[PDB]
Every structure is written in C-alpha cells, then in structure tokens.
Amino acid sequence: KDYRKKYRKYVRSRFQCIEDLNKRYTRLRLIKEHPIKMELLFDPDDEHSEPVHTVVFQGAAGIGKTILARKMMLDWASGTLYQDRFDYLFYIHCREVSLVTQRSLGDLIMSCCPDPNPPIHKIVRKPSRILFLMDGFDELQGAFDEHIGPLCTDWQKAERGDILLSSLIRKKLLPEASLLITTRPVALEKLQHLLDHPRHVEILGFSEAKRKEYFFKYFSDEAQARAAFSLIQENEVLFTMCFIPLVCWIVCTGLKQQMESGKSLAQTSKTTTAVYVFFLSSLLQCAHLWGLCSLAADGIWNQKILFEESDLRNHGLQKADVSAFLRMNLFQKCEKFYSFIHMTFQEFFAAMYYLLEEELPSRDVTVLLENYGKFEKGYLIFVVRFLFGLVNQERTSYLEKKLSCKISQQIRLELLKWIEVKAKAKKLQIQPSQLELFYCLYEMQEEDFVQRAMDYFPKIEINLSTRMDHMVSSFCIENCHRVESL
Ligand SMILES: CN1CCC[C@@H](NC(=O)Cn2nc(C(C)(C)O)n3c(cc4sc(Cl)cc43)c2=O)C1
Numbered sequence: 223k224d225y226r227k228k229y230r231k232y233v234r235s236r237f238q239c240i241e242d243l244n245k246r247y248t249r250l251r252l253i254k255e256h257p258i259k260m261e262l263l264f265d266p267d268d269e270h271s272e273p274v275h276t277v278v279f280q281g282a283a284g285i286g287k288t289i290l291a292r293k294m295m296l297d298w299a300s301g302t303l304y305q306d307r308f309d310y311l312f313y314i315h316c317r318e319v320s321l322v323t324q325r326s327l328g329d330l331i332m333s334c335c336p337d338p339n340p341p342i343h344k345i346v347r348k349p350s351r352i353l354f355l356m357d358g359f360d361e362l363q364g365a366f367d368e369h370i371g372p373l374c375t376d377w378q379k380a381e382r383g384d385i386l387l388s389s390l391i392r393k394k395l396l397p398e399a400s401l402l403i404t405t406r407p408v409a410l411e412k413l414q415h416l417l418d419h420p421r422h423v424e425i426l427g428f429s430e431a432k433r434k435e436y437f438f439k440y441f442s443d444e445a446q447a448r449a450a451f452s453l454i455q456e457n458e459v460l461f462t463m464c465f466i467p468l469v470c471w472i473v474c475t476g477l478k479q480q481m482e483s484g485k486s487l488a489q490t491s492k493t494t495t496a497v498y499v500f501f502l503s504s505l506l507q508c509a510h511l512w513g514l515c516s517l518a519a520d521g522i523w524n525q526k527i528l529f530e531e532s533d534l535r536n537h538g539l540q541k542a543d544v545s546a547f548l549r550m551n552l553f554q555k556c557e558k559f560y561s562f563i564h565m566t567f568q569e570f571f572a573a574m575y576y577l578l579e580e581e582l583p584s585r586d587v588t589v590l591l592e593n594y595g596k597f598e599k600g601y602l603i604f605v606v607r608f609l610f611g612l613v614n615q616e617r618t619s620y621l622e623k624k625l626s627c628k629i630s631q632q633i634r635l636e637l638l639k640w641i642e643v644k645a646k647a648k649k650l651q652i653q654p655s656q657l658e659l660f661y662c663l664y665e666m667q668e669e670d671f672v673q674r675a676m677d678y679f680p681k682i683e684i685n686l687s688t689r690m691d692h693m694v695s696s697f698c699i700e701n702c703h704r705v706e707s708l
C-alpha cells in the first residue's frame with residue numbers, strides 16, 4: 223500500500239523515455255486471435271468468464287516490442303493502465319536474465335525494485351495482483367528447451383534461470399499471477415509448448431497514417447518532415463518497409479545527415495541490406511570495422527547481447543571508440559553494460575564478419591548454416607538475410623569496397639547449394655520456409671542468382687500475410703521462368 227507508492231514513483235522515472243521522451247511514441251497496430259484496447263487484454267472477452275493470466279505479444283525484430291512494454295510500465299505507474307487490476311507490474315528484461323545462474327523468483331522480483339531490501343513477502347501476498355512483463359523471450363541467451371526440470375513451485379527456492387522462467391511461464395510458480403510475454407514469431411515454437419490457455423496478440427507495426435505521424439514527430443521542422451515522408455511515398459520499397467518502426471527510425475536518422483549536408487533528398491534503397499548500408503555510410507565522416515564485426519559475431523555465436531568494458535577493450539574498441547559509437551547511435555548504454563543500437567545491427571555486423579578482408583569466431587559459412595533456425599544461436603534470420611544482400615556483386619559503397627570479393631564469391635556458391643537443399647527437400651518442416659528463402663533472394667536482388675535459385679523450387683507454396691510478403695514474393699516469382707517458356 224505504502225511501498226506500492228514508492229515502486230510506482232520508481233517506475234514513473236525509470237520508464238520516462240525510449241532509452242535508459244515518450245512524446246515520439248506512435249500508436250502500434252495490435253490485433254488479436256494470432257482494434258485492441260490495452261485495458262481489456264486480461265479481461266475474459268469470451269464465454270470462459272475466468273480471467274486470462276497469460277498474454278503473448280508476437281512481433282518481429284524492430285516492430286516495437288520493447289517500446290510497447292516500456293509504454294505499458296509508464297502508463298500503469300501513472301494510474302492510466304490497469305490501475306484497478308495490478309498492485310505491481312514487474313519488468314523482466316530477458317536479455318539480462320541468465321539462463322544458468324541459480325536465482326529464486328524472489329531474487330528476480332527484488333532485481334526489479336529500487337531499494338536493496340524490498341518487502342518481498344508483502345509483494346507476494348497477493349499473486350493475482352502481480353503482472354510479470356517478460357520482454358523479448360527470443361533474447362534469452364543460450365538454449366531454452368522444454369525438457370528442463372523438475373518444475374519449481376516455491377517462489378523462494380533458487381533454481382537455474384531456465385528452470386525458474388520455465389516454471390513461471392508454465393504457471394507453476396505463482397499460478398494465478400498474470401504474464402505478458404513479448405516474442406519474435408520465430409521463438410513462438412519454443413514458447414507454445416509451455417503456454418497455459420494464452421491470449422495471443424500480434425504487433426503489426428505502423429499504419430500508413432502512423433508512418434506519417436512518426437515522420438512528423440521525428441522532424442520538428444514541418445518542411446523537413448513532409449519532404450522526408452514524400453521520399454518514402456515516392457519509393458515503393460521504403461514506404462512498404464516503413465511499417466516496421468525501427469525502419470522508420472533508421473530512414474529518418476539517415477535523411478537527417480543528408481539534410482545537414484544540403485544534398486537533394488533522395489534514397490534509392492530497394493532492400494534491407496541497402497537501407498542498413500545507407501544508414502551506416504551516413505555515420506562515416508571506418509577504422510574499427512574488423513573490431514565491430516568480430517564483437518557481433520562473438521556475441522551471436524557465444525550468446526552475449528550485453529558487453530561490459532572488458533568485452534569491448536579486447537576487440538580493439540578503446541575508451542574514445544566506444545564514446546564515438548555511443549554518440550553516433552551505433553551503441554547503447556543503471557546497467558554498466560553496452561549493446562548494439564538494435565539486435566538487427568548485431569546481425570548486420572555478424573553477416574559482415576564472414577565477408578571482411580583479412581589484412582576469433584569461425585568464418586566457415588557451412589557451420590553458420592548448420593545452426594540456422596536454432597534458438598541457441600538466436601535463429602540467424604537477419605545474419606543469413608544480410609549475408610545474401612552483402613554478397614551481391616552488382617552493388618557497392620565505400621563500406622562494401624572493404625569486403626573481400628574473393629570470399630564473397632565462394633560464399634555466393636554455398637548459399638545457392640543451401641537454397642537447393644532446402645527447396646528440394648520435403649522433410650524440412652522448419653526455418654527457412656519458402657517465403658523466408660524468398661526474403662533471402664530479395665536481399666540478393668541479382669537476377670543471375672535469383673533465377674538460378676528459383677529453378678530449384680518445384681512448386682510455389684507460400685502464405686502471404688503482409689504487403690512486404692507480397693512485394694518480396696512478387697519479385698521472386700517474376701524471376702522464376704521455366705527454361706522452355708515460349
Ligand atoms: C521468419 N520469416 C518467415 C517468412 C516471413 C518473414 N517476414 C518478414 O521478415 C517481414 N519483415 N520484413 C522485414 C524487412 C523486409 C524490412 O527486412 N523486416 C521485418 C522486421 C524487421 S526489423 C528490420 Cl531491420 C527489417 C525487418 C519483418 O517482419 C519472417
């Protein structure tokens with residue numbers, strides 16, 4: 223009662239803005255059964271009439287899972303959301319939770335609290351008044367399998383981080399406490415098996431009117447905001463891709479540098495690889511290109527998303543270099559840890575590690591592909607996708623001229639043999655799907671490669687769900703023509 227006041231005051235200041243104001247927050251399109259009012263998420267809006275205790279938010283990389291979870295904490299602490307339903311909302315940031323370290327649910331709850339000695343026994347008195355907000359399930363570093371056990375039913379017993387979170391998700395630990403898990407659809411395969419009567423909600427990103435809203439929030443000058451949005455409107459691809467809020471931020475940040483220069487506002491970008499290479503080349507006034515890539519490849523191959531001072535100092539990134547990338551919105555920072563500005567940037571530098579000119583992790587693309595779609599290595603969706611785009615010889619920049627074209631050709635051969643094995647195999651059943659291979663060929667864009675690869679698919683068997691799916695598939699199909707077509 224009196225401690226809840228202190229906790230809400232703490233939550234109000236800790237979730238004040240996007241990093242570490244919430245005026246740049248633009249509404250997200252949330253749809254259920256995967257017009258959703260957040261207050262009604264836990265209501266039994268069915269004939270069940272028994273409250274919903276598990277709510278799953280499935281959203282792709284950069285769609286706004288963390289931003290929605292942070293807005294949730296702030297709105298709740300401000301008496302605007304669930305004022306009547308929950309006494310405490312605990313924010314569990316999955317990228318900080320060790321899956322090996324032995325900790326109890328009490329120790330985890332106390333981790334979310336401001337003071338060293340919180341009234342843990344008083345908090346746990348009414349478990350139904352607690353909402354556990356697990357943000358980024360897919361960011362749990364290491365393996366997470368449904369065979370772990372025994373399951374824990376004591377909030378005070380210290381268990382392995384995987385047993386602990388597994389017992390909380392399965393609703394064995396505080397059975398009637400509420401849960402809000404945000405995950406990428408890829409990890410929804412691991413998750414589904416633990417879930418107890420969950421309510422599924424899909425984060426779809428920005429509406430065509432919310433992309434315009436974002437651009438106008440980003441640029442204070444209305445003349446700049448309208449010129450930036452008109453560029454997107456002119457470019458079919460950038461308009462389509464700007465449904466992902468992270469794409470809206472990357473695009474806006476890139477046009478700011480171009481605006482400061484005085485160059486006629488233009489962005490020809492046709493792929494995610496083109497956008498990522500455009501944003502990165504705008505930062506360049508690179509010297510630590512080997513260091514940045516090895517850090518990301520090591521962080522993907524050895525499951526490190528947060529890097530302390532020692533992790534950066536061994537990769538050649540001294541005090542000044544870290545402070546330059548933090549200022550250039552390449553790195554992020556009261557945790558004494560540093561990470562990439564996003565997970566998709568760590569995957570861009572991991573893909574780039576395999577193509578760098580020589581002048582610690584394994585650069586064998588064969589072993590990288592062997593771990594594709596595996597939870598342990600983070601699924602490697604964007605590593606492989608960016609790898610397809612960067613290998614395209616009919617594309618260059620000052621950044622790409624620093625990549626070895628000899629190993630880029632060898633890797634181009636192995637990516638064709640990978641498509642050939644995936645497509646000409648009925649027994650696959652898991653990632654990559656046919657649509658996912660279509661996204662890879664879309665990053666390639668080169669017609670000699672795309673046409674050779676599309677001749678491996680016997681029949682087109684895909685499920686379209688977005689206008690991005692239509693664009694990608696449309697491109698691959700129009701480059702799939704039978705040899706004797708006359
Ligand atoms: C696992 N597969 C199965 C087949 C269908 C796949 N659909 C997509 O990937 C659709 N899509 N498209 C992109 C683009 C094309 C911009 O790269 N992005 C998405 C999130 C982010 S964050 C970011 Cl940077 C780019 C990006 C997104 O969801 C998912």
Ligand SMILES: Nc1ncnc2c1ncn2[C@@H]1O[C@H](COP(=O)(O)OP(=O)(O)O)[C@@H](O)[C@H]1O
Nearest residue numbers: 246247248283284285286287288289467468471
């Ligand atoms: N609703 C939103 N309004 C404004 N910006 C947003 C919103 N959602 C996401 N973003 C932008 O996307 C970036 C990454 O989003 P985030 O939620 O961290 O991604 P993920 O879905 O991987 O958790 C943020 O830093 C921000 O710039």
